[PDB]
Write a protein that binds this DNA or RNA. Structure first.
Lengths: 151, 129, 149, 141, 262
RNA sequence: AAAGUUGCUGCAGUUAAAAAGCUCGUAGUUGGAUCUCUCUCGGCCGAAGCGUUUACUUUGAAAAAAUUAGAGUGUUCAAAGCAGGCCGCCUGGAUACCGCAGCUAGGAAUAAUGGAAUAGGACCGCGGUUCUAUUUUGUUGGU
RNA sequence: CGGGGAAUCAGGGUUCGAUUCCGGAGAGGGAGCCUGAGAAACGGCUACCACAUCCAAGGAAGGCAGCAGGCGCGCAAAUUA
């Protein structure tokens, strides 16, 4: 069913899947109600989260996290983990003895919700700070924009 | 190769005026060169100049006067905050009366006095005394 | 100065300030374009097309009379080679020197010139792949040289 | 020529770091081998036990015979040779006296007159040689 | 540490207490109470350093535990009891009443008030919540919980409350054009009318305030205490009326006062 | 510290310490000229998309004391201290600085960056297909 | 140990910050607990390791990087008020 790929039954804790309904409603349509919310800072909840079917407890829009604290950006560099990506933040650090700059970088592991598809290497991602979700992830993807050179 | 055409223009002007010439030809032209020469002109240092238009980067003929001792570029264009001007002038201008740090600010090309007056900083281009 | 020759010449072409088409040229832009078309059908590179148009047909600059330069004219109707003419000439020169090396093994000067030509080929191929004229998989191989000619 | 690029701070720092390592005062003060090999252990004075009394010959253009003490330092057991201001002051010094010793005065360098001595005797038996030589104090035994 | 601290070093004390360096190594260390440690004036500093009835801390204890000092109408015998902004101090033996409000320099002024003004105080509303069985509560800036407030009273509004009973008697909204006093930051002690509140979601709001002399200054929304409705304060103000003079006009006023008398 | 003998400011390398046999040759560093605010709902305005994103610059908020600079004050002077002064009263216990980074609101010169050329590019209207209106079918079943 | 900070001072810098304020860490070395709102506490407890005190030889007690003071170490630092 492309949903129950685990050894426990995956469901959204807030929605109830065992409502007692009539035969006409049974023959009408078999669509579950879906829990979603807004990451309310001028961030639009995507349609793939509202109309989707996936289950992710660490998703900003459908899971159990809240976005509070910093909001940063990065470029996607690696996408080889399961529901998390590794992004890169480049910056310039000012050495004031020389009055010059050196280029520095920080690698950041962020949680990518399944509602963001067609995320490529090099696309600009906007992440927001949440509570600790694993040992090394603290930020959660909220927006994706493509690279300006790509059509 | 030829980078920083403002540096080459200022070096040409300085070298020509130290040989006691009346006019100097500089190529190629640039809008930064023209604004720098306008900044010199409004302070009465290089007379008046004229831009020659070929369909390439143009040339400039400058009528030298003699009041200039040295004009120079500060490469690279260092970030100059509004405090650093005193430090920068105590590094660059040999006295408190004459000499000019030219800044490219968000309000355009100006000298350090007009930079102070409009209350802004920018990036340093050059100085002339 | 040149890239690898230490000499620094000046000889080039000096375009006049007059961009307007001169009055004596009775040829229109269209007739110039079909001249380009027959010239390309004769198996001519764009440089040779411009040279013949300047020498015989009186066209001072194709870009001044037609509004576009010759490669764009050949690209509009698809009469353009897959790879550009400078890369093609470097590759032909490399094949010629390599065949001479196959006949003559004591020519170390031809070996050094071959290294120089291949270096030009690599730099210009890097430039073209940056601007998408060549596909990203394109590579110059010494054995994959006579097949491109 | 040197680079002046606005994004070259890291290269400037790395080069200055290596070229500071080529500076001999920097290398002495930061490598550390100068303080491990110093008989004083990096201190200003040192106490020792006088082992013997010797005579070191002076330099060639000013020929003389200076008299020195061979003394083993207490805190590390190193042997050094120490200078006495004159031969009158040497009569206050006996074998097995605790002696406080300083450097000669040119900061680790030897004498321009006596070859190969760098230390001078300051105190013996917890009284200074100046106080003994001027009759201000006497020393015990 | 292994647990909470009980000592305050004197140089680490809040600077507006105006303690000196050589009297001791310790400062009086306010008790836990309705005010923060850094935003209060303890009772020993008031009775000794400012008001000078006492010369030592032992005399402060002798004054306080004869049951003479009321804070907000309640007798306190804790010598380090944290009193703070808008708190009414009543000494019935000498017949004195005070409000702890700020100077233009950010220090608690000795501000004497009328005994009818000592009947009430103002509080800034810090939270509104509904508790069990649908009962609305507000929490003020001095740790007061009042049940059943007016439904119009919101957070950042100011309640005018009666110290005899503790109930809501009147209130003032947060609105552009109301009078306010600044209780934190660099503009501590200044008074003016609110002219613009800009909102930063997920962050601190910035309120712009204009002085009665036309000077304008901004603060955070946390630092604003609304005092009077529109233009007239609902409490008595100190000698300065929230007007921060610069050092030049303060020197000029000092010289004119020295010239007029002497 | 003199010291420009560690040199960013600001050093040197023919003959004194020191520049590579020569050419090609990753990365990094550096790179010619050029381009002069609006749409909806609510009382001329407020909300909204921003305008390619920056780097840069400025403003605003916020930011322990002590120390440092610095205002006042005859500690007998001074180093200090935070006091004191006038015949109960009158006063002080200022102010500045507080790199960088992060919030805030402006600026658009400089330097990157992107936007249509196999046109599946804008601006309009005519549209056809699929999903989709939460209500204007008194209460309702509704194809 | 880190900062606040100190010396120098045209400016950039260079050297210092064990040390009275702020934050951290430790109580001979490790480890484990009890009680309590709060400790992995040592002027609490329980072991082992290293030292070490008394003894009638069975047993018992220990922790000055608190204030003084002593020994040692050393060039190097105060009164058992």
């Amino acid at each position: 069913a492309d949903i129950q790929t685990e050894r426990a039954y995956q469901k959204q804790p807030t929605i109830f899947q065992n409502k007692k309904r009539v035969l006409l409603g049974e023959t009408g349509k078999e669509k579950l109600p879906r829990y979603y919310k807004n990451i309310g800072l001028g961030f639009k909840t995507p349609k793939e989260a509202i109309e989707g079917t996936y289950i992710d407890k660490k998703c900003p829009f459908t899971g159990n996290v809240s976005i509070r604290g910093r909001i940063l950006s990065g470029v996607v560099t690696k996408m080889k983990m399961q529901r998390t990506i590794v992004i890169r933040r480049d910056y310039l650090h000012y050495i004031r003895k020389y009055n010059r700059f050196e280029k520095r970088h920080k690698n950041m592991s962020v949680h990518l919700s399944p509602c963001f598809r067609d995320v490529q290497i090099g696309d600009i991602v906007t992440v927001g700070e949440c509570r600790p979700l694993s040992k090394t992830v603290r930020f959660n993807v909220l927006k994706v924009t493509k690279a300006a050179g790509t059509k | 190769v030829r980078m920083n055409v403002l540096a080459d223009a200022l070096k040409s002007i300085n070298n020509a005026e130290k040989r006691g010439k009346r006019q100097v030809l500089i190529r190629p032209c640039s809008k930064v060169i023209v604004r720098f020469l306008t900044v010199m002109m409004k302070h009465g240092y290089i007379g008046e100049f004229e831009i020659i238009d070929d369909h390439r980067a143009g040339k400039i003929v400058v009528n030298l006067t003699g009041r200039l001792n040295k004009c120079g570029v500060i490469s690279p264009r260092f970030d100059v905050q509004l405090k650093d001007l005193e430090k920068w002038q105590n590094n660059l201008l040999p006295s408190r009366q004459f000499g000019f740090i030219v800044l490219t600010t968000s309000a355009g090309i100006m000298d350090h006095e007009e930079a102070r007056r409009k209350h802004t900083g920018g990036k340093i281009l050059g100085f002339f005394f | 100065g040149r890239m690898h020759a230490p000499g620094k010449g000046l000889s080039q072409s000096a375009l006049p300030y007059r961009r307007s088409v001169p009055t004596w040229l009775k040829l229109t832009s269209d007739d110039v374009k079909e001249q380009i078309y027959k010239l390309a059908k004769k198996g001519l590179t764009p440089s040779q097309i411009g040279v013949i148009l300047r020498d015989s047909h009186g066209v001072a600059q194709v870009r001044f009379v037609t509004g576009n330069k010759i490669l764009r004219i050949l690209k509009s109707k698809g009469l353009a080679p897959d790879l550009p003419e400078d890369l093609y000439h470097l590759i032909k020169k490399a094949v010629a020197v390599r065949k001479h090396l196959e006949r003559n093994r004591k020519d170390k000067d031809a070996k050094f010139r071959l290294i120089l030509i291949e270096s030009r080929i690599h730099r210009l191929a890097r430039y073209y792949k940056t601007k998408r004229v060549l596909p990203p998989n394109w590579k110059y191989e010494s054995s994959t040289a006579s097949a491109l000619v | 020529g040197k680079c002046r690029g606005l994004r070259t701070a890291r290269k400037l720092r790395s080069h200055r770091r290596d070229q500071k390592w080529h500076d001999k005062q920097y290398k002495k003060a930061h490598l550390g081998t100068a303080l491990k090999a110093n008989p004083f252990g990096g201190a200003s004075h040192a106490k020792g036990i006088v082992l013997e009394k010797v005579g070191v010959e002076a330099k060639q253009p000013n020929s003389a015979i200076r008299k020195c003490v061979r003394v083993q330092l207490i805190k590390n057991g190193k042997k050094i040779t120490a200078f006495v201001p004159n031969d009158g002051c040497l009569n206050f010094i006996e074998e097995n006296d605790e002696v406080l010793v300083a450097g000669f005065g040119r900061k680790g360098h030897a004498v321009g007159d006596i070859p190969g001595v760098r230390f001078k005797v300051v105190k013996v038996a917890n009284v200074s040689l100046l106080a003994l030589y001027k009759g201000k104090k006497e020393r015990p035994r | 540490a292994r647990g909470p601290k009980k000592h305050l070093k004197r140089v680490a004390a809040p600077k507006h207490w105006m303690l000196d360096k050589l009297t001791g190594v310790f400062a009086p260390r306010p008790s836990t109470g309705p005010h923060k440690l850094r935003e209060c004036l303890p009772l020993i500093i008031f009775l000794r350093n400012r008001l000078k009835y006492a010369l030592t801390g032992d005399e402060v204890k002798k004054i306080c535990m004869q049951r003479f000092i009321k804070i907000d109408g309640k007798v306190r015998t804790d010598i380090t009891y944290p009193a703070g902004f808008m708190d009414v101090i009543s000494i019935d033996k000498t017949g004195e009443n005070f409000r702890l409000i700020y100077d233009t320099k950010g220090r608690f002024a000795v501000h004497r008030i009328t005994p009818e003004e000592a009947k009430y105080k103002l509080c800034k509303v810090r939270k509104i919540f509904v508790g069990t069985k649908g009962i609305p509560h507000l929490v003020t800036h001095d740790a007061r919980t009042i049940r059943y407030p007016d439904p119009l009273i919101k957070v950042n509004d100011t309640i005018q409350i009666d110290l005899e009973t503790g109930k809501i008697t009147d209130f003032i909204k947060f609105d552009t054009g109301n009078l306010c006093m600044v209780t934190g930051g660099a503009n501590l002690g200044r008074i003016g009318v609110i002219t613009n509140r800009e909102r930063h979601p997920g962050s601190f709001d910035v309120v712009h305030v204009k002085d009665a002399n036309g000077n304008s200054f901004a603060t955070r929304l946390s630092n604003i205490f609304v005092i009077g409705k529109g233009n007239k304060p609902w409490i008595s103000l100190p000698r300065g009326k929230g007007i921060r003079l610069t050092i030049a006009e303060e020197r000029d006023k000092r010289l004119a006062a020295k010239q007029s008398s002497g």
